[PDB]
Design an enzyme around this catalytic site. Structure first.
Site, PDB file in Angstrom:
ATOM      1  N   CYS A 109       0.801  -1.229   0.000  1.00 10.41           N
ATOM      2  CA  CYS A 109       0.000   0.000   0.000  1.00 10.41           C
ATOM      3  C   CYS A 109       0.843   1.294   0.000  1.00 10.41           C
ATOM      4  O   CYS A 109       1.575   1.582   0.954  1.00 10.41           O
ATOM      5  CB  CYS A 109      -0.929   0.017   1.232  1.00 10.41           C
ATOM      6  N   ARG A 112      -0.172   4.615   2.763  1.00  7.72           N
ATOM      7  CA  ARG A 112      -0.057   4.539   4.216  1.00  7.72           C
ATOM      8  C   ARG A 112       0.236   5.809   4.991  1.00  7.72           C
ATOM      9  O   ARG A 112       0.204   5.786   6.211  1.00  7.72           O
ATOM     10  CB  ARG A 112       0.932   3.436   4.592  1.00  7.72           C
ATOM     11  N   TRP A 281      -9.190   5.777  -1.168  1.00  4.74           N
ATOM     12  CA  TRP A 281      -9.520   6.486  -2.398  1.00  4.74           C
ATOM     13  C   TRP A 281      -8.519   6.050  -3.437  1.00  4.74           C
ATOM     14  O   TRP A 281      -7.455   5.540  -3.107  1.00  4.74           O
ATOM     15  CB  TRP A 281      -9.543   8.024  -2.235  1.00  4.74           C
ATOM     16  N   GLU A 286      -4.264   3.418 -10.996  1.00  6.98           N
ATOM     17  CA  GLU A 286      -4.990   2.161 -10.784  1.00  6.98           C
ATOM     18  C   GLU A 286      -6.083   2.033 -11.845  1.00  6.98           C
ATOM     19  O   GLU A 286      -6.314   0.947 -12.404  1.00  6.98           O
ATOM     20  CB  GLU A 286      -5.651   2.132  -9.406  1.00  6.98           C
TER      21      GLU A 286
HETATM   22  C1  HEM Z   1      -6.358   6.447   1.742  1.00  7.05           C
HETATM   23  C2  HEM Z   1      -6.029   6.131   0.435  1.00  7.05           C
HETATM   24  C3  HEM Z   1      -5.355   4.971  -0.004  1.00  7.05           C
HETATM   25  C4  HEM Z   1      -4.669   4.903  -1.143  1.00  7.05           C
HETATM   26  C5  HEM Z   1      -4.450   6.027  -2.152  1.00  7.05           C
HETATM   27  C6  HEM Z   1      -4.159   3.555  -1.281  1.00  7.05           C
HETATM   28  C7  HEM Z   1      -3.525   3.094  -2.416  1.00  7.05           C
HETATM   29  C8  HEM Z   1      -3.139   1.793  -2.641  1.00  7.05           C
HETATM   30  C9  HEM Z   1      -2.622   1.324  -3.924  1.00  7.05           C
HETATM   31  C10 HEM Z   1      -2.305   2.144  -5.206  1.00  7.05           C
HETATM   32  C11 HEM Z   1      -2.473  -0.035  -3.752  1.00  7.05           C
HETATM   33  C12 HEM Z   1      -2.137  -1.052  -4.851  1.00  7.05           C
HETATM   34  C13 HEM Z   1      -3.458  -1.600  -5.392  1.00  7.05           C
HETATM   35  C14 HEM Z   1      -3.281  -2.497  -6.608  1.00  7.05           C
HETATM   36  O1  HEM Z   1      -2.397  -2.192  -7.443  1.00  7.05           O
HETATM   37  O2  HEM Z   1      -4.040  -3.493  -6.728  1.00  7.05           O
HETATM   38  C15 HEM Z   1      -2.893  -0.381  -2.408  1.00  7.05           C
HETATM   39  C16 HEM Z   1      -2.926  -1.683  -1.885  1.00  7.05           C
HETATM   40  C17 HEM Z   1      -3.379  -2.043  -0.594  1.00  7.05           C
HETATM   41  N1  HEM Z   1      -3.896  -1.125   0.341  1.00  7.05           N
HETATM   42 FE1  HEM Z   1      -3.966   0.895   0.158  1.00  7.05          FE
HETATM   43  N2  HEM Z   1      -4.482   2.777  -0.214  1.00  7.05           N
HETATM   44  C18 HEM Z   1      -5.314   3.614   0.540  1.00  7.05           C
HETATM   45  C19 HEM Z   1      -6.080   3.143   1.630  1.00  7.05           C
HETATM   46  C20 HEM Z   1      -6.049   1.876   2.177  1.00  7.05           C
HETATM   47  C21 HEM Z   1      -6.799   1.495   3.352  1.00  7.05           C
HETATM   48  C22 HEM Z   1      -7.846   2.353   4.072  1.00  7.05           C
HETATM   49  C23 HEM Z   1      -6.391   0.233   3.686  1.00  7.05           C
HETATM   50  C24 HEM Z   1      -6.763  -0.598   4.773  1.00  7.05           C
HETATM   51  C25 HEM Z   1      -7.336  -0.199   5.963  1.00  7.05           C
HETATM   52  C26 HEM Z   1      -5.457  -0.154   2.655  1.00  7.05           C
HETATM   53  C27 HEM Z   1      -4.873  -1.409   2.600  1.00  7.05           C
HETATM   54  C28 HEM Z   1      -4.188  -1.891   1.442  1.00  7.05           C
HETATM   55  C29 HEM Z   1      -3.778  -3.253   1.262  1.00  7.05           C
HETATM   56  C30 HEM Z   1      -3.911  -4.382   2.286  1.00  7.05           C
HETATM   57  C31 HEM Z   1      -3.306  -3.364  -0.029  1.00  7.05           C
HETATM   58  C32 HEM Z   1      -2.873  -4.658  -0.749  1.00  7.05           C
HETATM   59  C33 HEM Z   1      -4.064  -5.245  -1.501  1.00  7.05           C
HETATM   60  C34 HEM Z   1      -3.669  -6.348  -2.466  1.00  7.05           C
HETATM   61  O3  HEM Z   1      -2.643  -7.015  -2.217  1.00  7.05           O
HETATM   62  O4  HEM Z   1      -4.404  -6.548  -3.469  1.00  7.05           O
HETATM   63  N3  HEM Z   1      -5.226   0.868   1.741  1.00  7.05           N
HETATM   64  N4  HEM Z   1      -3.324   0.749  -1.727  1.00  7.05           N
HETATM   65  N1  LIG Z   2      -6.737   2.430  -3.589  1.00  9.58           N
HETATM   66  C1  LIG Z   2      -7.016   1.164  -3.213  1.00  9.58           C
HETATM   67  N2  LIG Z   2      -6.631   0.179  -4.010  1.00  9.58           N
HETATM   68  C2  LIG Z   2      -6.824  -1.274  -3.832  1.00  9.58           C
HETATM   69  C3  LIG Z   2      -8.145  -1.669  -4.517  1.00  9.58           C
HETATM   70  C4  LIG Z   2      -8.184  -1.247  -6.011  1.00  9.58           C
HETATM   71  C5  LIG Z   2      -7.192  -2.038  -6.918  1.00  9.58           C
HETATM   72  N3  LIG Z   2      -6.857  -1.138  -8.064  1.00  9.58           N
HETATM   73  C6  LIG Z   2      -7.767  -3.394  -7.410  1.00  9.58           C
HETATM   74  O1  LIG Z   2      -8.556  -3.416  -8.358  1.00  9.58           O
HETATM   75  N4  LIG Z   2      -7.380  -4.498  -6.746  1.00  9.58           N
HETATM   76  C7  LIG Z   2      -7.569  -5.947  -7.185  1.00  9.58           C
HETATM   77  C8  LIG Z   2      -6.819  -6.337  -8.484  1.00  9.58           C
HETATM   78  N5  LIG Z   2      -5.479  -6.712  -7.964  1.00  9.58           N
HETATM   79  C9  LIG Z   2      -5.508  -7.090  -6.529  1.00  9.58           C
HETATM   80  C10 LIG Z   2      -4.973  -8.534  -6.496  1.00  9.58           C
HETATM   81  N6  LIG Z   2      -4.201  -8.955  -5.500  1.00  9.58           N
HETATM   82  O2  LIG Z   2      -5.230  -9.341  -7.391  1.00  9.58           O
HETATM   83  C11 LIG Z   2      -7.010  -6.963  -6.181  1.00  9.58           C
HETATM   84  N7  LIG Z   2      -7.662   0.877  -2.092  1.00  9.58           N
HETATM   85  N8  LIG Z   2      -8.047   1.673  -1.110  1.00  9.58           N
HETATM   86  O3  LIG Z   2      -8.488   1.124  -0.041  1.00  9.58           O
HETATM   87  O4  LIG Z   2      -7.977   2.946  -1.200  1.00  9.58           O
END
Ligand code: HEM
Ligand SMILES: N=C(NCCC[C@H](N)C(=O)N[C@H]1CN[C@H](C(N)=O)C1)N[N+](=O)[O-]
Ligand code: HEM
Ligand SMILES: N=C(NCCC[C@H](N)C(=O)N[C@H]1CN[C@H](C(N)=O)C1)N[N+](=O)[O-]
Ligand SMILES: C[C@H](O)[C@H](O)[C@H]1CNc2nc(N)[nH]c(=O)c2N1
Ligand SMILES: C[C@H](O)[C@H](O)[C@H]1CNc2nc(N)[nH]c(=O)c2N1
Ligand SMILES: [Zn+2]
EC number: 1.14.13.39
Lengths: 405, 405
Positions: A109, A112, A281, A286
């Protein structure tokens, strides 16, 4: 020097040592013989108790009462609960701390910097699919906040011994249907063909568009999943247009405002929350680069390049690169116009560098997965490309779990 | 055991069985992945002998004469030499096979589809810095070939116990000077400030331009390095212009045609060649994105963006991305106009995917460093982004070594 991984930033020449990795109690996939860092995918009262004590110690350290009477009393209370019931339950404040730490600990993520602002909704009293739907709708309303998005997570009851799991079958609360066609192609999102067919199998009457919002398949313990359609008024979408290419609006593209992952497991002190959807958000790449341009997703690169009249016959014209930049610009422009929160990849990576500095001081390091933190377009134009990162697993954590079907 | 490797765009899977042949450890452990780190944090006769036997075995298998009489005899010769002298010498045919295998085994090289075509110059009879210079000049002329570049490597004498190494102090055979100015700013290439100062300190009379080719500092064993200026006519350069932006040529930018790493160590059968410069041809993003756009390099993004009259007020206009694409296009256009070999990142990555398939069939896998194989711009628009990779060290190999000063 220090007997910890030495980490360098090649743009600035600065060096730090990661001492936080010493707190990891779970092994990753790498070994001295080979690195598997680029791979996507990775109870006994005995192990449960150790995990619970570790978590309670983390919680009492966070409130600065480590070794105190209250700390010792909580520890004995957990041991006795596990001793007589095989499990235990978290106090409200412990769950809040835990969910925030799982986000803070997520190596993949880039968002963070916001970790301390998470709104944690306690839904551990949920007892039916219908009530899960009410909690989910409330989460969506609160998180969307008419475009001024707010980070949130809703936590449903933990896994219990000898009882089925609470599960949300959808991978995200909001996703577009994918309909397999006669000729083998897909209308809609190819990534969601399986979930779409499952919804149909469970009684959903499908649409026929490219952007049909899927219904939710919610499963309460030991019961077949139940189907719920999201009221359209609650699902905020953004039609896509370009600031200078007037014909872009004519492509009829759109995307939803709320990214809400709903199939991950939240692990806190040995307890497992199989249903705990979270949302923040979007980072613009993405949507603009992955969802719209991946060859196995909407795959719109060639369509857009043709409208821009680029030479799609040869790679050296960099038509893919030019079209992708325009698509990403349209996503940013459109969300800004619609007043829906979104962050561009330059701003997100700059804020993540600030987060790394904050965490170096607060905890001695920050686990990060370089391949996921560096954006899918313009990688070296962002500061994170030049920053070495250490990846390891800390708990509380969000983890992948098998599909329920 | 054997890692499962998936391609997420195609859904295809393979198993890497080649990693079992790795005899040297990387930086990762089950507790933490350091795959994103750039650099890693007489020999025992027994060890040397085992490395030599393994290599000779690889060589005889390659010419399909394994177990033959020649194989047994050669094994005996190497054993005899090591037992009596503590070291041994490679025959020229073995050196050629070994150089090609080290290239084939290099995890960070996306150009490996060309591995079987490598001109190997045997320079192991070099006894002075002046002789090194002649071999280097012939290498450059051969490899440049008036713009129709040909891959080549020149191998100088191996390291020997208790004797200084033959070394080329420059990081590449052709590099631009970097001159520190009063205000701490740099005229020319900031990455080359240290070597530029060493050249001056060794008697070079500096220029004062932005693109002044550095002289070579060559070192024979246990002697101070000697300075040699490269004949201007041997160093082919390409003036950079843009196909549609007439003013680009006015920036006065240019780059050299030949990329030629000269500071890496080549290890074959336990023997180490501390000076073994190699060259192929450029992938355009190396110049357009890293050399010209890195903040700590020529850093021309903002200048180009302003010339394009882009909105550099906020990151959301994606001005950095738009400028980067045009600079990469100028590099491609300019090299094609000058009739100098170059490959764009799409073509290069597509050829690397073919190489992965060829190697899966030939050896059961291919060591590859995902962070280095995926291009610095437009990462996900290339096939390699969606391909899981396994990184490990095979020998023969190219390795980093300490700077000679
Ligand atoms: C506040 C704005 C946030 C932004 C801009 C953000 C952005 C991102 C991005 C760009 C990724 C990669 C997603 C992908 O390529 O599939 C990601 C993954 C992730 N985020 Fe964040 N994040 C945010 C909030 C959160 C929140 C609120 C949580 C949890 C409480 C979180 C937990 C995670 C986790 C666990 C992943 C890994 C998911 C996976 O492996 O598919 N994120 N986030
Ligand atoms: N900005 C995100 N991003 C995570 C969710 C959107 C992300 N672009 C998505 O479509 N996630 C899928 C496709 N790849 C991840 C996987 N492990 O296969 C799940 N989340 N958030 O809480 O603010
Ligand atoms: C035929 C043209 C070739 C192309 C297109 C090519 C391309 C590349 C690229 C893009 C990189 C990454 C460079 C960087 O980002 O610093 C690289 C690294 C490397 N290449 Fe190739 N290469 C070619 C020929 C060669 C040859 C002939 C050899 C050796 C015989 C070779 C050995 C290596 C090694 C060892 C690395 C890693 C260098 C390092 O760690 O700094 N390459 N190559
Ligand atoms: N195309 C290349 N590229 C490799 C050499 C050029 C590369 N762009 C370069 O400047 N390499 C330097 C900076 N980074 C490498 C390092 N490990 O520090 C060396 N090689 N070849 O033989 O054809
Ligand atoms: C094979 C490779 O690990 C895979 O394509 C990864 C690379 N980096 C990524 N980074 C992010 N943020 N999201 C992804 O889905 C991926 N996919
Ligand atoms: C910190 C990070 O490893 C570093 O910036 C790497 C990333 N990927 C790279 N990839 C290539 N091809 N060349 C490089 O110099 C780098 N630098
Ligand atoms: Zn690793």
């Amino acid at each position: 020097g220090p007997k910890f991984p030495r980490v360098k930033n090649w743009e600035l020449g600065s060096i730090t040592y990661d001492t936080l990795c010493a707190q990891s109690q779970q092994d990753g996939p790498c070994t001295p013989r080979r690195c598997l860092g680029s791979l996507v995918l990775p109870p006994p009262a005995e192990q449960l108790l150790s995990q619970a004590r570790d978590f309670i110690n983390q919680y009492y350290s966070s409130i600065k009462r480590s070794g105190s009477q209250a700390h010792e009393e909580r520890l004995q209370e957990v041991e006795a609960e596990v001793a007589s019931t095989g499990t235990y339950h978290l106090r409200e404040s412990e769950l809040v701390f835990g969910a925030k730490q799982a986000w803070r600990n997520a190596p993949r993520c880039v968002g963070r910097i916001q970790w301390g602002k998470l709104q944690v909704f306690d839904a551990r009293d949920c007892s039916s699919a219908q009530e899960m739907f009410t909690y989910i709708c409330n989460h969506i309303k609160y998180a969307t906040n008419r475009g001024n998005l707010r980070s949130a997570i809703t936590v449903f009851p933990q896994r219990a011994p000898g009882r089925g799991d609470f599960r949300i079958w959808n991978s995200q609360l909001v996703r577009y249907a994918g309909y397999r066609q006669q000729d083998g192609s897909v209308r809609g999102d190819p990534a969601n063909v399986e979930i779409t067919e499952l919804c149909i199998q469970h009684g959903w009457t499908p649409g026929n568009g490219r952007f049909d919002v899927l219904p939710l398949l919610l499963q309460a313990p030991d019961e077949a999943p139940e189907l719920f359609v999201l009221p359209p008024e609650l699902v905020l979408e953004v039609p896509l247009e370009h600031p200078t290419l007037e014909w872009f609006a004519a492509l009829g593209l759109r995307w939803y405002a709320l990214p809400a992952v709903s199939n991950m497991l939240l692990e806190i002190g040995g307890l497992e929350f199989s249903a705990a959807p979270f949302s923040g958000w979007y980072m613009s790449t993405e949507i603009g680069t992955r969802d719209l341009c991946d060859p196995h997703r909407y795959n719109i690169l060639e369509d857009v390049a043709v409208c821009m009249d680029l030479d799609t016959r040869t790679t050296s014209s960099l038509w893919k690169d030019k079209a992708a930049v325009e698509i990403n610009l349209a996503v940013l422009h459109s969300f800004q116009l619609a007043k829906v929160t979104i962050v561009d990849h330059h701003a997100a990576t700059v804020s993540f560098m600030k987060h790394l500095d904050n965490e170096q001081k607060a905890r001695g390091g920050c686990p990060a997965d370089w391949a996921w933190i560096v954006p899918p377009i313009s990688g070296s134009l962002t500061p994170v490309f030049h920053q070495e990162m250490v990846n390891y697993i800390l708990s509380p954590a969000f983890r992948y779990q098998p599909d329920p079907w």
